[PDB]
Design a protein around this ligand. Structure first.
Ligand SMILES: CC(C)(C1=N[C@@](C)(C(=O)O)CS1)[C@H](O)[C@@H]1CS[C@H]([C@H]2CSC(c3ccccc3O)=N2)N1
Ligand SMILES: [Fe+3]
Lengths: 571, 569
């Protein structure tokens, strides 16, 4: 609706200013009719007062429409800033799973294009909509006061164009939605085709994907062509009868029919001429208005979706921080129906201080959900996860982020180039501490070999950082913060050989003296651990050390036999 | 310029050049005859303030004749668009863009990093060319109709004619005279708007690391200060650019006032132009609606100009030179002779000065310390780009003598696939050979071991996979791609690093599938893991864009990064 306007004191003002501007423009045309009557009655004396009225109402109309646009644009900018502020304060408290999903193509796209389309609605269109209300609702009264017989013709032609355009809009009531459906489907086909071009180039001629794109294109073409036919055989008539020329054609012959059998007054005719002129260009932004307000209603419904979407992670700060333990208590969590991560039926396991815990999983989702859920991506349904004795559901979000220090696969880096990108935890950078934290295995040589030193720009527009060195940077950060529980996902994630040796030395420095829950896939780091847990399809199956599980005869000796065989290429 | 827009518009419409030229002529004659009807409005009013019913009849009949003619002509000029001839125009434009995207060298397609989304965005935004008749109707009306009405009132009067001619039909050049100031200020606004979009992207992605560093509140305050700085720049720009915007929007009334004052000055003095002032005011009041339409459509004019410029720039790049295209070899001994290819000019000689030999019916390996380097040669073998110096050859025949078709069906590449495009998986296997039946798809799926997992998967080989293509592990995705390259019996197979996903399912199934595929085949494995490379028969080490020691495994054991590379495993 109009519910997203808390700036309505400064939009109702711009609305009334544009309405009075249109009303004084009508007053200017009426004073022009007055001055022409005075110059026809006595055509030797220059008309002085009502021509001064003409130029006064013109400069008043210009000043009022200027202040109308200034108030409307300041109101639009204030609405845009307050709406992006409420979006940022809401997206701070989104659970990071759904926010990471919308971080691909949605929440930045909505936080830009929603408020930009809201600016093009409430800035450059609502004074026009006020003018389109006010002018043909006062010009009918002026036309009826000026002539009983002559306003009927120009009113009949404008109502004729109105009923023809509304009849043309009513026949396209579903076909516009079908056109938008065809456009979104064919733009999806264009998306998959341009993403498809390299692989379908190297796998065949491209003929299958080109046919799969050409068929959706021809479907959109047939939809657009039948819409143009079925709407256009009336829409050409609507566009050609809203021209000033049929209004002139009825007006000239109505003047002739009034002159033919008497009772015709020239001044009342030229008043109807100028006001009947002034109606149509005011009423044309009402022809564009539904076209604009459809997309505006789509954008406002999108922002009401984003402003009220999540469960907001249930923030609870009503507890104290304890230390160094980690306990799963019969927890159960499944993702939303469109998400990654299969499930976790029932897991319970308790790890004291100073044990390195390896989670080994064949799934990639049974062993990732535990680390993501420990980092409070979401909340488990039925169960309790406790760092120390205290539940993390009631954990102060400062204290919880003081406890856990995490690394992952994708590992985003900011434009704070390095010395504030490593030291991002503290607001200030004690620089020599960042030197010592980058003195671990291979941060220092990769930074020192860079052309611009420790301020070599990484950012959005800098160096690629070769993938693995981003992981080395955040390893230096996680070793700088020295929070007691460190959460891994990258134990030899990227198989570059010197990067593998360097990351293993750096992780041997970083895991030392911390309750580390490490999610690996290559078991070379898993075989040196304390309590190894196996995760198949969201259920905990194994427990115990490396040797005890291998002697147990369970899933783990089979998954170990699989690995040592698959290291050798030939069988 | 304004003639280059017409040339690019008459070319990129396509085979409707005759209908577009006919409709441009229809709209020009329609605007011109409407202006002549507006001139015929003059002696109507001159007869009308007197009695003169015969004069009013003898000119209103001509007004009806010159009104019906231009209304019919505007009806045909828009009947270019509303019979449907623009749908065929943009359809032919998009089907020419499709064949040009299928014919483009992949080098420009990939090295255009912004050019990727640029080509995708233009191919999706080419429905913005729908405005071309509703903009050639408004612009042409606003320039021609006041010009012909004014060139007729030069014959009715002298001075009202010059005041009308200098002001009203030159209004569209008086807008494009003041346009580049608005384009510069809109550039200043759009640059900060794009910087804000980049900062929002950075916030939304790095939310998680921003929260675990504990500084989420600080970057929230930084984003709120950035929002207030953007609103203050928007207000400071709009406050100093609203005068020109309001003058341009009300220039038709502020030009009407000049005619009203000057005409009254002429009426009261002895040069009694009688009611031609009233008719001229009633004429140039009705130039308000097309000018108000044109100032609404000018942003679409700029988008149409940029789209046509980008289209004529995009369809000007040509495929690779193909000299003596009739050959196709049968002696698949891939040979490279002094190849030096410049990926980007910032880091020249990316694949510098190589000389390779991949002998037939064997496996030859590439190894290196970078993602590129040893994958740029596997790009060059697919005719990604012409080598800047040197020759590349499948046997005795150079690659430049082959078609893109014979080369793109001669070899088969396997990499980390992000595809299958949300449909049946029988077609996703059979897309490498549409001339392959149902009995060979199951043969390839049995020889590439995706068969047990796809029988475990539901829907029984119908299998729409409509949940964005991915609901399964990447390891069986790799088995699908291996079966796809196995179906097309290509005598040269390029392998990427095909083993990076899991331990049991991905690694064992993909190893079982790949060790089937290498049999009497020239294959190029470029995986970094020196065990699978150590099993091979010919070793090429790519060290900073140049090979250094080509030989067998013992030649790698001669002098290398030997002990570290074998110790890290
Ligand atoms: C792109 C286009 C030029 C637009 N049209 C606008 C003016 C509209 O709001 O229509 C908004 S962008 C097309 O016309 C599209 C095609 S689908 C719809 C058709 C259905 S019938 C009709 C119409 C009828 C009477 C007068 C003018 C018209 O355009 N338009 N609009
Ligand atoms: Fe339309």
């Amino acid at each position: 609706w109009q519910v997203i306007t808390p700036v309505r004191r400064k939009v109702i003002l711009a609305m009334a200013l544009a309405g009075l501007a249109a009303l004084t423009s009508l007053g200017a045309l009426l004073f022009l009719a007055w001055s022409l009557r005075d110059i026809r009655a006595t055509p030797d004396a220059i008309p002085a007062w009502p021509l001064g009225g003409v130029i006064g109402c013109v400069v008043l109309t210009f000043v009022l429409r200027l202040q109308a646009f200034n108030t409307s644009h300041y109101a639009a900018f204030h609405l845009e800033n307050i709406l992006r502020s409420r979006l940022a304060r809401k997206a701070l408290q989104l659970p990071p799973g759904v926010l990471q999903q919308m971080g691909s193509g949605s929440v930045a796209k909505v936080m830009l294009d929603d408020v930009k389309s809201l600016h093009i609605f409430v800035a450059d269109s609502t004074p026009l909509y006020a003018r389109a209300i006010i002018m043909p609702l006062a010009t009918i009264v002026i036309l009826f006061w000026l002539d009983w017989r002559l306003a009927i013709a120009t009113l009949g032609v404008l109502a004729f164009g109105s009923v023809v355009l509304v009849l043309a809009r009513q026949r396209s009531e579903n076909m516009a939605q079908r056109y938008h459906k065809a456009r979104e489907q064919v733009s999806a086909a264009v998306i998959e085709f341009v993403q498809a071009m390299p692989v379908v180039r190297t796998f065949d001629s491209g003929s299958t994907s080109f046919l799969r794109y050409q068929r959706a294109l021809e479907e959109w073409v047939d939809v657009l062509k039948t819409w143009y036919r079925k709407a256009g055989f009336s829409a050409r008539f609507s566009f050609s009868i809203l021209n000033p020329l049929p209004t002139l054609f009825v007006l000239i012959w109505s003047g002739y029919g009034l002159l033919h059998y008497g009772s015709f007054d020239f001044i009342a005719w030229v008043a109807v001429l100028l006001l009947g002129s002034g109606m149509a260009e005011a009423v044309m932004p009402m022809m564009m208005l539904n076209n604009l307000v459809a997309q505006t209603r789509l954008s406002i419904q999108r922002i009401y979706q984003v402003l009220a979407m999540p469960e907001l992670s249930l923030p609870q700060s009503d507890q104290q921080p304890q230390e160094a333990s980690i306990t799963f208590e019969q927890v159960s969590f499944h993702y939303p129906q469109a998400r990654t991560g299969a499930a976790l039926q029932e897991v319970s396991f308790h790890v004291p201080a100073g044990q390195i815990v390896a989670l080994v999983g064949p799934s990639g989702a049974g062993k990732s959900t535990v680390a993501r859920l420990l980092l409070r991506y979401a909340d488990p349904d039925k169960g309790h996860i406790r760092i120390g004795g205290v539940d993390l559901r009631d954990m102060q979000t400062d204290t919880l982020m003081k406890q856990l220090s995490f690394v992952f696969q994708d590992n985003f880096l900011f434009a704070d180039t390095i010395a504030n990108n490593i030291r991002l935890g503290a607001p200030d950078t004690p620089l020599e501490a960042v030197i010592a934290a980058a003195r671990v295995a291979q941060a220092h040589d990769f930074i020192s070999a860079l052309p611009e030193g420790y301020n070599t720009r990484v950012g959005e527009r800098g160096v690629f950082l070769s993938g693995g060195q981003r992981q080395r940077i955040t390893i230096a950060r996680a070793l700088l913060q020295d929070r007691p529980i460190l959460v891994l996902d990258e134990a030899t994630a990227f198989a570059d050989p010197e990067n593998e040796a360097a990351l293993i030395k750096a992780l041997a420095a970083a895991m030392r003296g911390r309750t580390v829950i490490m999610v690996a896939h290559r078991l070379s780091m898993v075989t040196q651990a304390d309590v190894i847990l196996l995760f198949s399809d969201g259920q905990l199956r194994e427990m115990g050390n490396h040797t005890q599980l291998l002697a147990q005869g369970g899933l783990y000796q089979r998954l170990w036999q699989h690995y040592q065989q698959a290291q050798h290429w030939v069988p | 310029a304004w003639r280059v827009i017409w040339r690019q518009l008459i070319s990129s419409v396509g085979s409707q050049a005759r209908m577009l030229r006919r409709s441009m002529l229809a709209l020009l004659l329609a605007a011109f005859m409407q202006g002549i009807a507006f001139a015929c409005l003059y002696p109507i009013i001159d007869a009308l303030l007197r009695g003169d019913a015969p004069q009013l009849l003898n000119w209103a009949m001509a007004f009806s004749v010159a009104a019906i003619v231009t209304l019919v002509l505007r009806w045909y000029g828009l009947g270019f668009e509303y019979r449907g001839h623009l749908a065929q125009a943009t359809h032919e434009l998009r089907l020419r863009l499709g064949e040009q995207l299928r014919r483009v060298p992949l080098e420009k397609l990939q090295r255009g990093r912004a050019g990727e989304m640029n080509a995708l965005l233009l191919g999706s935004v080419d429905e913005n060319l729908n405005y071309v008749i509703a903009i050639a109707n408004i612009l042409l009306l606003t320039i021609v109709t006041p010009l012909t009405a004014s060139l007729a009132t030069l014959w009715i009067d002298w001075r009202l004619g010059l005041v009308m001619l200098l002001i009203f039909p030159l209004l569209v050049p008086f807008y494009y005279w003041r346009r580049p100031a608005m384009r510069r200020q809109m550039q200043t606004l759009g640059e900060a708007h794009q910087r804000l979009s980049g900062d929002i992207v950075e916030f939304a992605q790095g939310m998680m690391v921003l929260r675990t560093c504990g500084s989420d509140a600080d970057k929230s305050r930084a984003l709120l200060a950035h929002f207030n700085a953007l609103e203050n720049l928007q207000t400071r720009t709009h406050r100093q650019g609203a005068g020109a915007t309001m003058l341009i929007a009300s220039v038709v009334e502020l030009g009407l006032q000049v005619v009203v004052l000057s005409g009254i000055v002429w009426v009261v003095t002895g040069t009694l132009n009688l009611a031609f002032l009233i008719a001229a005011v009633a004429m140039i009041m009705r130039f308000a609606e097309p000018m108000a339409m044109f100032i609404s459509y000018t942003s679409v004019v700029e988008l149409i100009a940029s789209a046509l410029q980008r289209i004529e720039q995009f369809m000007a790049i040509a495929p690779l030179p193909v000299a003596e295209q009739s050959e196709m070899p049968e002696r698949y001994d891939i040979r490279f002779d002094n190849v030096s290819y410049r990926y980007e000019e910032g880091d020249g000689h990316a694949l510098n000065h190589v000389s390779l030999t991949f002998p037939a019916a064997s496996m030859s390996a590439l190894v290196g310390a970078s993602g590129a380097g040893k994958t740029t040669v596997t790009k060059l073998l697919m005719r990604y780009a012409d080598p800047q110096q040197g020759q590349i050859s499948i046997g005795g025949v150079d690659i430049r003598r082959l078609t893109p078709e014979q080369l793109n069906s001669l070899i088969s590449v396997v990499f980390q696939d992000v595809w299958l495009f949300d449909d049946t998986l029988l077609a996703n296997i059979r897309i490498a050979r549409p001339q392959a039946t149902r009995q060979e798809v199951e043969e390839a799926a049995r020889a590439a071991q995706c068969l047990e997992f796809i029988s475990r998967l539901p829907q029984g080989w119908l299998t729409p996979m409509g949940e964005m293509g991915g609901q399964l592990s990447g390891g069986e995705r790799q088995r699908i791609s291996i079966a796809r390259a196995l179906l097309k019996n290509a005598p040269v197979v390029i392998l990427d690093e095909p083993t990076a996903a899991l331990d049991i399912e991905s690694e064992l199934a993909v190893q079982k599938a790949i060790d089937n595929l290498v049999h009497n085949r020239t294959v190029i494995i470029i995986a970094h893991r020196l065990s699978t490379i150590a099993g091979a028969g010919n070793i090429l080490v790519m060290e900073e864009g140049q090979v250094v020691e080509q030989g067998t495994h013992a030649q790698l054991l001669s002098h290398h990064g030997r002990y570290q590379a074998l110790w890290q495993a």
